[PDB]
């Protein structure tokens, strides 16, 4: 019944870049294909005078060579016709870190407690996503209250990602 076509997903209504600024702690994530951020992920979003949103992300990555590295990532966001969907160009402080361009959608957020992000890096022919990632972020590293957990679960279901997230540890590795 429920549609899994990317184009039908609801996003944050009238998203406010300025209220979203600040520190966000990744609590859980749905990983995409390939090398990705493993844990201890913390993001810091900022918005300049002109309305340009950017962010820096910190996190542990396990290199294919088994080297554990703390990646210092940077991302710049381009606005689209939907204030909640952005085009994010990203790169690392270190030249060997992954560089790319990914859609960045804010599915939902109350700005003060939690946020649900999503990106579809490859569309199936039917319109569903073939390779996606999603992060559940929190303002507080202690997490959310049960009431908030219930809203986050619903958003997960809405993206057709229910049961596919794993909790992320924070142990100050970076």
Ligand X SMILES: CC1=C(/C=C/C(C)=C/C=C/C(C)=C/CO)C(C)(C)CCC1
Residues in binding site: 98
Minimum CB–partner distance for residue 148 and ligand X (Å): 20
Binding residues for substrate: 98
Subset of 54-73 contacting ligand X (CB under 6 A) = 55, 57, 61, 71, 73
Binding mask 75-94 for ligand X (x = CB under 6 A): x--------------x----
Stretch in the footprint of ligand X (CB under 6 A) among 9-17, 31-39, 120-128, 141-149: 31-39
CB atoms within 10 A of CB 89: 14
Q: Is residue 171 packed enough to be buried (19+ CB in 10 Å), middle (13-18) or exposed (0-12)?
A: exposed
HEC assignment per residue over 65-105: CCCEEEEEEEEEEEECCCCCEEEEEEEECCCCCCCEEEEEE
Q: Any contact of residue 35 with ligand X (CB under 6 A)?
A: yes
Point out which residues bind ligand X (CB under 6 A): 35-37, 43, 55, 57, 61, 71, 73, 75, 90, 97-98, 135
């Amino acid at each position: 019944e429920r549609d899994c076509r990317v184009s039908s997903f609801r996003v944050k209504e009238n998203f406010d870049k300025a209220r979203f600024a600040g520190t966000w702690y990744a609590m859980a994530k749905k990983d995409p294909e390939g090398l990705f951020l493993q844990d201890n992920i913390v993001a810091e979003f900022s918005v300049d005078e002109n309305g340009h949103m950017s962010a820096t992300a910190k996190g542990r990555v396990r290199l294919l060579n088994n080297w554990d590295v703390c990646a210092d990532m940077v991302g710049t966001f381009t606005d689209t016709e939907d204030p909640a969907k952005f085009k994010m160009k990203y790169w690392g402080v270190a030249s060997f870190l992954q560089k790319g361009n990914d859609d960045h959608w804010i599915i939902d957020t109350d700005y003060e407690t939690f946020a649900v992000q999503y990106s579809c890096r490859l569309l199936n022919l039917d319109g569903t996503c073939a390779d996606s990632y999603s992060f559940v972020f929190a303002r507080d590293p202690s997490g959310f209250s049960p009431e908030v957990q219930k809203i986050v679960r619903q958003r997960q279901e809405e993206l057709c990602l229910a049961r596919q997230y794993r909790l992320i540890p924070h142990n100050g590795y970076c």
